[PDB]
C-alpha cells in the first residue's frame, strides 16, 4: 500500500494550463523556505523551478509514465523528461 509522499519521490506534477510534469519532491536544505501546510517543494525537471503543491496535483511516476511521459512542445519539458529517466536524484543547482 502507499505511504505518504517523501522527498526524493518521482512524480508527474499537474499546474493550472501546464500539461502533466516530471517532477521530484524535493528536501529542504537547512535555511530554506519551509512550504506552507499540507504543501510540499516541487522541483520541476527540465525548467529546474520550484512550486508548492498539494497531494492532488502529484501523479506518481511509475504508474503515470505510460500516460503523461511522451514528448512535450513546451520548453523545458523534453530535458525533463531525460532527468527523471536518467538522473532523477542528481543536483541540478
Given at each position: 500500500m502507499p505511504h505518504a509522499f517523501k522527498p526524493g519521490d518521482l512524480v508527474?506534477?499537474?499546474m493550472k494550463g501546464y500539461p502533466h510534469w516530471p517532477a521530484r519532491i524535493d528536501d529542504i536544505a537547512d535555511g530554506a523556505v519551509k512550504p506552507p501546510p499540507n504543501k510540499?517543494?516541487?522541483f520541476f525537471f527540465g525548467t529546474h523551478?520550484?512550486?508548492?503543491?498539494?497531494?492532488?496535483?502529484?501523479?506518481?511516476?511509475?504508474?503515470?509514465?505510460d500516460k503523461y511521459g511522451k514528448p512535450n512542445k513546451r520548453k523545458g519539458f523534453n530535458e525533463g523528461?531525460?532527468?527523471?529517466?536518467?538522473?532523477p536524484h542528481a543536483s541540478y543547482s
Open positions: 508527474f506534477a499537474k510540499y517543494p516541487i523551478e520550484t512550486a508548492f503543491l498539494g497531494p492532488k496535483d502529484l501523479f506518481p511516476y511509475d504508474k503515470s509514465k523528461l531525460w532527468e527523471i529517466q536518467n538522473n
